[PDB]
Structure formats: C-alpha cells, structure tokens
C-alpha cells in the first residue's frame, strides 16, 4: 500500500488513515510505503491513531517503469516526426518501438544512421524522464509482419469504446498507429485479426504523432503508472 | 431507433460489418433512415437495399460534430522558444476552446511579445482547420498566476497526487487544466490553484516535459473520453 504523507513526518493524514485502516484495514506493525512526490520509502505502522503513526525503515529509489511491456508499432512518418514520437513515447513509458512500413507510409525503409539517431533520442529521453530502462527501437517491418497480440489497441474513427473501458492493466500492451495517411481498412482488418481492439480518440482529426501520444498517455501516465 | 454507421467516403454502400449489425441486430429494413459518417463527412441516409452489403442513398449532408461540448480552458505556464506553438497546436486538435499563458514563479519568460501572440493565434487558426474544427481556440495575452479565476472544475498534474483523471472528471462541467513550466509549479502555486478549485491529478511515475504533460492531461479529458 502506498499512502500519501507530506514530508514523511511519521504521522499519517486523516484521509490516508481511514483509507487503509478502515477500507484496507491496517494493523500496527504492518509495513507500507510512504511518499509525497519528493521521496518514497518503506515504513512501519507504529500507532493506529487516528491519526496513524509510523516509522521510516528505508528510503528507496521510486520505480519508474509502467509494469508491463508497452510496445508501440508506429508507421514511418514524414519529416523528423518519428524522432519526436520516440522521445515522448519514452517519457510515456514505452518499452519497445517498432517502426512499420505501411500502404500509406511515405518512407518504406530506414537507414542504419537514422535508426542509430532514434536510439540516441530514446536513451536521452529515458534519462530525462527518470527511467533506467531504455526503450528498444527496432528496424522497420511490414505491417503484415505485426504479430498476434494478447492485448492491442488501435484508434479508429468507427470505434465507440474508450481506452479505459477495454484496458487490462496487468496484461502486456501493444498499440498500433498508422501514418499521416492512416491505416487502410484492409490493414485495420489485419490488426483486429492480430488481436488489436479498435478504440475511440474523439471527435477531431489528429496528427499521427498526437494520436500515438494520446493512446499511450491513456494507457500509462493517465492510469497513474 | 437512431444509429450511425461508419461508411468510408459515404459511397452508398456500407462495409459488411456495419451491414450485419444494422440488418441482423438492429433489424434494418428498406426505407429506414440512419446516419453514415467517415471522420471527414456525415449525412442522413435511407436504406435502399439490405444487400448485403447494405446500400443507401444520401438524404442530406451534415457537419461532423467536432467540439468537446463544454468549455475547455488550458492555463499553461510560459515556455521558452517554440514550445508554446507546439502546445497550442496539440491543444487545438485536442479540443481546447481557450488558451491562457501564465507567468509563474519558475516560468523562464515573464512576458510575451505581440509577435509571439500573433504567431500562436496563427497556429490556433491553422490547427483548427487541420483538425476539422470550425471553432478556433482563443489565445490570450499572458496573466499572472494569481489572476487565474475560481473555476467550476479544474485539474492540475501533481507529483504527489494519486487520483486519476478518469476518477475525477465530470464531463458535464466546463473544464480548466493547469500546467506548469519545466521548473514546474511551486508548492505555494499548487496550493493557490487548489484554492481556485483545481483538483490535483496523477500523470504517472515518470518525469514529463511541460508540453507532454499538457498533451496527456488534455487527451485524458477529451479525445480519450471519446469527446
């Protein structure tokens, strides 16, 4: 259990106390995690209060990973937009980025130099986002080469389901995003066959980069992970 | 018995999936009226043949709904360079109706010239067109953080927060979102925002650039909610 405690003073705020002593039931001696954004640490229940008291046993570095694999299958884009996507996707917790060649993608391949550069962007973004895990960026693959997945999401204009209504937070995650031209219906068809669930991204037309980041943000940062 | 079916290009013929759903599930019949759409256009249609695939004729063209449906105001700290242009563009495609730059304790720039304001307005205009919107987000000159008004509903990303946007959002009320600079909102600035009516929400375990936090916070409230 992670309980918010301003400054890790040893005493837990009123709300926090009720939340774990009544709703989660917490006895004395039980160990739990304390945090206030600035810090995090293991602590022990000393007094059940209220307000509940505790003692700091050990400070520790906050975990930064989402918790499950988050693979982003994203089509090759125009300009240097793929570099920005890789940077934000890394901040958003992706663990793997798989560029794709698709019917409407303009580029149909990617040199070694470009790939190396994208890997440098990921390395840098990982550091700045506090991650120790650097997302893997791979050589492009054709769309029909995308694998069968346990859980996948693809934004589609016809979809009505929201990401929060289909997402299983303990299952690995695969997200598919098409190029500026979008995925062709036959492609969306193959994606669904592969296990990708179509979801809604709203009423407006989004740039491919934005759709990619919004889908990701809905699954990671938005879920508080 | 209204229903809207996805029909790429509004060509008069529905995809097999939509056909089966209308015919098999909704019990559609020749003469019935329904809505067809494809992200670009929309229209009232009338069933001409169940096929399959189902064929229909367009009765009248209609404008796709593009707005979130309530006011969406982004209160964002001044950022260096073209960062704000990027924020404005993404905010526009994400449904913002108003963008209010803020001078904050840690915001690098403390003012904005007419040239930047005009540029931001040009970006809003353009982005509105590219996202299919008729409405163009208003972009205001900067104001001190203290000038932020009391809000009916507000959310601010905060490291120590635990509530997720989806656990707090009220789709029926106008929405205010606050995003600090790279240096982030100071302790007393977050307190001030809560005083104004902003609820702290969590954006996860990783450090995010101001631009990305803004995109994420908006996406969780509009696009992500199917709005």
Closest CA to A102 of A74, A78, A79, A71: A74
Q: Which of B204, B213, B222, B227 to mutate to test the interface with A (most CBs of A within 10 A)?
A: B204
What is the domain range of residue B22?
Answer: 1-65
Chain A residues in contact with B223 by the CB 8 A cut-off are 201-202, 204, 206, 214
Per-residue tokens: B64: 């796709």
Whether residue B136 sits in one domain with residue B26: no
Domain boundary among B65, B90, B105: B65
Same domain, A134 and A38: no
Inter-residue contact A16 to A53 (CB < 8 Å): no
CA dist A86 and A136 (Å) reads 10
Pairwise CA distance, residues A159 & B99, whole Å? 29
Of A157, A164, A225, the CB nearest to B204: A225
d(CA B119, CA B122): 5
Verify that A137 and A75 share a domain, yes or no: yes
- Same domain? B73 vs B54: no
- Asked which of A38, A64, A90 is the last residue of a domain, the reply is A64
Between residues 138 and 197 of chain A, which touch chain B (CB distance below 8 Å)?
157-158, 160, 162-164, 185
User: How far, in Å, CA of B126 to CA of B124, rounded?
Assistant: 6
A16–B contact, CB cutoff 8 A: no
Q: Which two tokens stand for residue A115?
A: 């790939």
Concatenated DSSP letters of chain A: -EEE-TT--SB--HHHHHHHHTSS---TT-EEEEE-SS-EEEEEEEE--SSPEEEEEEE-PPP-S-SS-EEEEEE--STTHHHHHHHHHHHTT-SEEEEEE-TT-S-----HHHHHHHHHHHHHHHHHTT-SS--EE---EEGGGPPP-SSEEEE-TT----HHHH--TTS-EEEEE--TT---HHHHHHHHHTTEEEE---SS---HHHHHHHHHHHHTGGGT-
Query: How far is the alpha carbon of A109 from chain B, nearest alpha carbon, in Å?
Result: 27
Specify whether B13 is located in the same domain as B43.
yes
B195, B111: one domain: yes
Question: Which of A45, A64, A83 is at the close of a domain?
Answer: A64
Residues B204 and B176 in one domain: yes
CA B70, CA B82: separation in Å to the nearest integer? Answer: 28
* CB-CB under 8 Å, B223 with A204: yes
Q: Which of residues 95-124 of A touch B (CB under 8 A)?
A: none
Closest CA to B80 of B113, B114, B107: B107
Backbone angles phi, psi at B99, to 5 degrees: -130, 120
Residues A111, A181: one domain? Answer: yes
Q: Give yes or no: residues A111 and A180 share one domain.
A: yes
Asked if B1 has any chain A CB less than 8 Å from its own CB, the reply is no
Q: Are residues A22 and A88 in the same domain?
A: no
Tally of domains in chain B: 2
A109 with A200, same domain: the answer is yes
Residues of A in contact with B134 (CB under 8 A): none
What CATH number does the domain containing A48 carry? 2.40.240.20
Same domain as A118, residue A30: no
- What CATH number corresponds to the domain at position A217? 3.40.1280.10
């Amino acid at each position: 259990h992670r309980a918010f405690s301003p400054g890790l003073t040893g005493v837990l705020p009123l709300r926090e106390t009720r939340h774990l002593v009544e709703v989660l039931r917490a006895r004395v001696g039980d160990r739990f995690t304390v945090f206030d954004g600035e810090r995090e640490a293991l602590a022990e229940v000393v007094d059940l209060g209220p307000p509940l008291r505790y003692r700091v046993l050990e400070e520790r570095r906050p975990e930064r990973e989402v918790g499950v694999e988050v693979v982003l299958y994203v089509a090759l884009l125009k300009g240097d937009k793929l570099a920005e996507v890789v940077r934000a996707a890394t901040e958003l917790g992706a663990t793997r980025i798989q560029p794709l060649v698709t019917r409407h993608s303009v580029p149909k391949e990617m040199g070694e130099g470009k790939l190396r550069r994208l890997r440098a962007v990921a390395l840098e973004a990982a550091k700045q986002s506090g991650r120790v895990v650097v997302p893997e960026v791979l050589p492009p693959i054709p769309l029909k080469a995308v694998p069968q997945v346990a859980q996948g999401l693809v934004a589609h204009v016809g979809a009505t389901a929201r990401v929060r209504e289909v997402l299983d937070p303990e299952k690995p995650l695969a997200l598919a995003v098409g190029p500026e031209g979008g995925f062709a219906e036959e492609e969306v068809a193959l994606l669904e066959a592969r296990g990708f669930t179509p979801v809604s991204l709203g009423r407006r037309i989004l740039r491919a980069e934005t759709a990619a980041l919004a889908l990701l943000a809905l699954c990671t940062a938005g879920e508080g992970r």
